[PDB]
Scaffold this active site. Structure first.
Site: not given
Ligand SMILES: Cc1cc2nc3c(=O)[nH]c(=O)nc-3n(C[C@H](O)[C@H](O)[C@H](O)COP(=O)(O)O)c2cc1C
Ligand SMILES: O=C(NCCO)c1ccc2cc(CCc3c(C(=O)O)[nH]c(=O)[nH]c3=O)ccc2c1
Ligand SMILES: Cc1cc2nc3c(=O)[nH]c(=O)nc-3n(C[C@H](O)[C@H](O)[C@H](O)COP(=O)(O)O)c2cc1C
Ligand SMILES: O=C(NCCO)c1ccc2cc(CCc3c(C(=O)O)[nH]c(=O)[nH]c3=O)ccc2c1
Lengths: 313, 313
Positions: B44-45, B131
């Site tokens: 997870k990021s 992000c």
């Molecule tokens: C629940 C969820 C959490 C995710 N968390 C991250 C994340 O922490 N960091 C990130 O780079 N992408 C995150 N993604 C994006 C996925 O890595 C991927 O780029 C995106 O879901 C599109 O691929 P898919 O069509 O296979 O779902 C997340 C996606 C989902 C659905």
């Molecule tokens: O607080 C946030 N959103 C509400 C309005 O500020 C917020 C904070 C940090 C975040 C950080 C990310 C990066 C992690 C990520 C997420 C995620 O963990 O939400 N979801 C994705 O589909 N791709 C991602 O790369 C995405 C959304 C975020 C939203």
């Protein structure tokens, strides 16, 4: 229980119309859209000079949508202007004319000539901003300077209520920025969200080939692919532009889809790919289905639910 | 016949891994991904301090895909570092570690600390560029100066091969521009295309409500919605970044979806939504289906057709 609406000083039987580009290029197409039970129609986006467009194949469709790189084939402004002034039947339904000049000067030229017909006949302008400017610059709407420019110049040259066709946006800062720009222009009475999702690539697995010829197979995406995108943008602009109308466009195939567009804040609802695939008979289905949803829920007019999407907490 | 491959000096049993975000947050998660058939896993990021993320519900999925706004909940970088240091069994498969700091400073502080573990263990860095920045300025990948800064600063502090996670672009000028920036950096050996399609909105027709609680229901889109978009970006980066690897992410539910990703130029293939929905068993199916297509066409290696999608003429 009805689908009727009055807006921009016109009356519309229902919220439905074609998307610009679909079934609106020749006299024959326009006459067909006019005979259909769409609430309204929009003419193919035109340029000053007639264009042949890109080489074929240049459009293709699949269960979940379409890809196109038409390159703006159209019969030339003179043709659509004559259709607006001489051939169209306004007693049947209102007409939108979509212009998509390749430079700001081409756009000014056409609109200056459009103004008196707009005044006299009531034809409505839809300025297409999801169009190329100079190559290697983003298309006009992804470049807020260029967009400001086109809007001042077109507001000056035209001096009448018009509407604008927007590409989709994906970032909040862009929604913030583009709405602020649009709000500077009292004459932009309406905003259409959205044009095709730009430069997708469809690959066919049996032949290992792209499916359209121009641009190495990169083209704009429409259909089911784009619904949630279309809805986010409808609702972003509906929330940030309290004084403008939002027209929804993107992935409509059913009344339910139209319903969702409307809850998001849509006034009119356009149909591209689904119309291309199904033909103008789609408009009666859409109306019945949306009316069925309204009946089941106790809604009597569109204004009872427009913009009324609920958030959690 | 089999699917193994070698890249960035690591051997992979096959080209499948999870997407960052999915089944990769707790030790339980990572242990499960490891026991799966995936060729690799990404964590997870993470941020320096643990985060709770956004109010639930914050993820929802539907037949055509998913929407999420998780808000980057994670156990903090110490945890994932300790997992990379002491817990992960590298004999089983390579590990990627995704970092997604909220500023360049937070990101530099993480990487100096990860550099020695990478050296020693071979864990790989995926820098999440997709992000916040969501203050007032566009997110980092859509802001090419900010992108140049994070890249310079991070390649300075890290001093090892790493890769970047990219959000999708929708314009030829942006591909040309984003690509030119990444090509400035010899240390960026891989580009992952793409992250979720930013800010779509899913509305449920029955309850006339958005489906997720944060950001008024707006969130990143994954799944079948984004496949042609994921494929245009894989291929746009493939063609513009001849000295880098492209990893495809987005819309993989089948062997066929993976096949098209590779034809488009992808070396690794990442599964997000489909994995969230079907669970880790998905890797055995995808492997089979991809081997099945290869056999029917008489391809022995991924190298044979990687990037070899045909255009017309
Ligand atoms: C629940 C969820 C959490 C995710 N968390 C991250 C994340 O922490 N960091 C990130 O780079 N992408 C995150 N993604 C994006 C996925 O890595 C991927 O780029 C995106 O879901 C599109 O691929 P898919 O069509 O296979 O779902 C997340 C996606 C989902 C659905
Ligand atoms: O607080 C946030 N959103 C509400 C309005 O500020 C917020 C904070 C940090 C975040 C950080 C990310 C990066 C992690 C990520 C997420 C995620 O963990 O939400 N979801 C994705 O589909 N791709 C991602 O790369 C995405 C959304 C975020 C939203
Ligand atoms: C063949 C075709 C031609 C199009 N031509 C135009 C056009 O000339 N001007 C325009 O603004 N949009 C054009 N569009 C985009 C549609 O107007 C609409 O914005 C987009 O297809 C999304 O709608 P849909 O999801 O219902 O297909 C075209 C789309 C297609 C498929
Ligand atoms: O030269 C072009 N394409 C190939 C060479 O780079 C070219 C020229 C004019 C264009 C004009 C448009 C605007 C018209 C349009 C079209 C269209 O006619 O191609 N398709 C869409 O999905 N939406 C549109 O708004 C779109 C693409 C174009 C491509």
């Amino acid at each position: 229980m009805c689908l009727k609406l009055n807006l921009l000083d016109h009356v519309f039987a229902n919220p439905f119309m074609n998307a610009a580009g679909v079934l609106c290029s020749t006299e024959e197409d326009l006459r067909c859209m006019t005979a259909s039970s769409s609430g309204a129609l929009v003419s193919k986006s035109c340029t000053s000079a007639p264009r042949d467009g890109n080489p074929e194949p240049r459009y293709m469709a699949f269960p979940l949508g379409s890809i196109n790189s038409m390159g703006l084939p159209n019969l030339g402004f003179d043709f659509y202007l004559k259709y607006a002034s001489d051939l169209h039947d306004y007693s049947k339904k209102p007409l939108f004319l979509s212009i998509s000049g390749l430079s700001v000067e081409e756009n000014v030229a056409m609109v200056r000539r459009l103004a008196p017909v707009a005044q006299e006949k009531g034809v409505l302008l839809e300025l297409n901003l999801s169009c190329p400017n100079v190559p290697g610059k983003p298309q006009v709407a992804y470049d807020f300077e260029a967009m400001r420019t086109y809007l001042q110049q077109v507001s000056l040259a035209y001096g009448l209520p018009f509407g604008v066709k927007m590409p989709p946006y994906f970032d909040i800062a862009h929604f913030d920025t583009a709405a602020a720009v649009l709000n500077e222009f009292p004459l932009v009475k309406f905003v259409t969200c959205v044009n095709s999702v730009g430069n997708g690539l469809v690959i066919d697995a049996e032949s290992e080939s792209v499916v359209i010829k121009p641009k190495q197979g990169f083209g704009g995406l429409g259909g089911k692919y784009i619904l949630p995108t279309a809805l986010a943008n409808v609702n972003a602009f509906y929330r940030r532009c309290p004084d403008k109308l939002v027209f929804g466009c993107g992935g409509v195939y059913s009344g339910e889809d139209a319903f969702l567009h409307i809850l998001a804040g849509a006034s009119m609802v356009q149909v591209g790919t689904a119309l291309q695939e199904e033909g103008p008979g789609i408009f009666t289905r859409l109306e019945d289905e949306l009316l069925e949803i309204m009946a089941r829920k106790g809604y009597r007019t569109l204004e009872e639910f427009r913009g009324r999407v609920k958030t959690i907490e």
